[PDB]
Design an enzyme around this catalytic site. Structure first.
Site, PDB file in Angstrom:
ATOM      1  N   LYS A 115       0.810  -1.217   0.000  1.00  0.00           N
ATOM      2  CA  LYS A 115       0.000   0.000   0.000  1.00  0.00           C
ATOM      3  C   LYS A 115       0.845   1.269   0.000  1.00  0.00           C
ATOM      4  O   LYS A 115       0.487   2.233  -0.677  1.00  0.00           O
ATOM      5  CB  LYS A 115      -1.080   0.000   1.077  1.00  0.00           C
ATOM      6  N   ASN A 138      -1.929   6.550   6.429  1.00  0.00           N
ATOM      7  CA  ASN A 138      -1.182   5.558   7.180  1.00  0.00           C
ATOM      8  C   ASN A 138       0.291   5.538   6.799  1.00  0.00           C
ATOM      9  O   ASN A 138       1.113   5.014   7.566  1.00  0.00           O
ATOM     10  CB  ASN A 138      -1.830   4.186   6.950  1.00  0.00           C
ATOM     11  N   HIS A 183      -2.709  -8.123  12.022  1.00  0.00           N
ATOM     12  CA  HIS A 183      -3.485  -7.459  13.075  1.00  0.00           C
ATOM     13  C   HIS A 183      -4.489  -8.383  13.747  1.00  0.00           C
ATOM     14  O   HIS A 183      -5.530  -7.931  14.220  1.00  0.00           O
ATOM     15  CB  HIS A 183      -4.184  -6.209  12.534  1.00  0.00           C
TER      16      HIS A 183
END
Ligand code: UMA
Ligand code: A1AQS
Length: 438
Positions: A115, A138, A183
């Site tokens: 990303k 982010n 996560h």
């Protein structure tokens, strides 16, 4: 939106929380801020006039709020935050606040790996076209700091955490690059709960860019009229391989021989495809977008050669904070001699077993450290050594390095058990590589 007169409570005294404090103060609203950590990093940077509470969440403040602004690092499932939601108190994050104010189109990018590379590529494509572009999220520059009435395009990297608290994003183009386990300490309903957060990025997007090779990047109702795909051997944007030569292709037409790129590896070629698809959907000229693919040299800490000396490459891939990212480093990796692989840190409850199939043969050694070091060494105990710290691991491996070898920090884990962040881990690795390798 109009926040005047509202009781606003921010959770988190990190980069996000500090940017939110500044956002509200500049609009004539004094928020209050809390953080569960006793000594959070932004405490010393907080303006003196702002009330703060540390060491826990303060229910007196949450239950009195008109608006709760949750940093991505606090779980919505925290009992105090869940109690506030149960009472109907509005909860948003910084990305939500941003979308409500932004006056230019937004390209929105998520995924388990790639990303930041795709986000930066789209930004470079915009710059090459002469577009005033704001790149953040982010990737490390809080989105609210991008707000600028002169900006003509925003490119946001978004995490699953940020997406959970975002409801007003209407991206001109949005992608989920891939979905692999990450996560899990924050997603007790597993991979599909993590995926569900990412799927929010497509809601009200004008164009959705999906990965033809990863079904979890598709909307649950399936691909629709908004969907443009990229992939290796199939997709609207795809690759064409021949005799040691690879091309980016769009609907059958060659657009770029990847020898002109500075990045390499199949996953970076598909990152280039995804970036091009997003840029095309945002209306950027194709010619300048292709030029940017040839100028971009990579990001710090992402498979970054920090030293090449005496026949040995020392590679800082500290940004590999999950298994899929380390797999991308290992898959297709050529090493003339022995690979000395550094693994370790906080694995976030990940299953490391997908890495084992890359660790066979006689030319691999593992040096495992940090919180989950023992679990990583268990991938192949007979070639593994375990230390407490990365420095100990590097001083253990350095005497064993021979010309032709590679030393690769691609740890498959977060750094937060022992470092400020993955950048500090990568910088420490680079310093040690220079000491031990030259
Ligand atoms: C954890 C996270 O989502 N971090 C992103 C965040 O940074 P920021 O400094 O604001 O983080 P934060 O929300 O304060 O949380 C940081 C840490 O503090 C902890 N924390 C936070 C608040 C609190 O009350 N208690 C607490 O213990 C969190 O569990 C986390 O471990 O906002 C920045 C700007 O948008 C991002 O660049 C940054 O991405 C970093 C690179 C990251 O690691 N992101 C994760 C999602 C990832 O990429 O895997
Ligand atoms: C086919 C499939 O796997 N669909 C799916 C979709 C979402 C989830 S996530 C979830 C599920 C229950 C629940 N109850 N409370 C919470 N927070 N959740 N979250 C899981 C599976």
């Amino acid at each position: 939106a109009d926040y005047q007169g509202k009781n606003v409570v921010i959770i988190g005294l990190g980069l996000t929380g500090l940017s939110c404090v500044d956002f509200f103060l500049a609009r004539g609203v004094t928020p209050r801020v809390m953080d569960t950590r006793m000594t959070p990093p932004g405490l010393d940077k907080l303006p003196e006039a702002v009330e703060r509470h540390t060491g826990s969440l303060n229910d007196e403040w949450l239950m009195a709020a008109d608006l709760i602004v949750a940093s991505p690092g606090i779980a919505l499932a925290h009992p105090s935050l869940s109690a506030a939601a149960d009472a109907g108190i509005e909860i948003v994050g910084d990305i939500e606040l941003f979308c409500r104010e932004a006056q230019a189109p937004i390209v929105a990018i998520t995924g388990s790996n790639g990303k930041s590379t795709v986000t930066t590529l789209v930004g470079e494509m915009a710059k090459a076209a002469g577009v005033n572009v704001g790149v953040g999220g982010n990737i490390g520059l809080p989105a609210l700091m991008l707000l600028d009435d002169e900006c003509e395009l925003y490119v946001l990297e978004l995490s699953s955490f940020q997406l959970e608290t975002t409801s007003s994003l209407q991206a001109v183009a949005a992608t989920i690059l891939n979905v692999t386990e990450d996560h899990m300490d924050r997603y007790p309903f597993g991979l599909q709960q993590y995926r569900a957060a990412k799927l929010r990025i497509y809601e009200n997007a004008k164009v959705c860019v999906v990965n033809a090779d990863d079904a979890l990047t598709m909307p649950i109702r399936g691909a629709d009229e908004r969907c443009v795909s990229f992939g290796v051997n199939m997709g609207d944007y795809h690759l064409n391989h021949q005799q040691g030569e690879t091309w980016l292709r769009v609907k059958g037409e060659k657009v770029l021989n990847v020898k002109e790129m500075k990045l390499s590896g199949q996953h970076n070629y598909t990152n280039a495809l995804a970036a091009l698809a997003l840029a095309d959907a945002a209306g950027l000229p194709r010619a300048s977008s292709l030029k940017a693919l040839t100028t971009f040299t990579g990001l710090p800490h992402r498979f970054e050669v920090v030293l090449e000396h005496n026949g040995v490459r020392w590679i800082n891939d500290s940004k590999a904070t999950n298994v899929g990212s380390t797999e991308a480093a290992l898959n297709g990796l050529h090493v003339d001699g022995t690979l000395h692989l550094l693994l370790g840190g906080d694995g976030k409850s990940a299953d490391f077993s997908p890495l084992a199939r890359y660790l066979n043969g006689d030319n691999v050694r593992l040096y495992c450290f940090g919180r989950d070091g023992a679990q990583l060494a268990a991938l192949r105990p007979e070639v593994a050594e375990q230390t407490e710290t990365m420095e100990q691991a590097m001083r253990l491996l350095a005497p064993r390095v021979q010309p032709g070898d590679m030393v690769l920090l691609s740890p498959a884990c977060a750094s937060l058990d022992q470092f400020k962040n993955f950048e500090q881990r990568g910088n420490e690795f680079a310093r040690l590589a220079k000491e031990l390798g030259g």
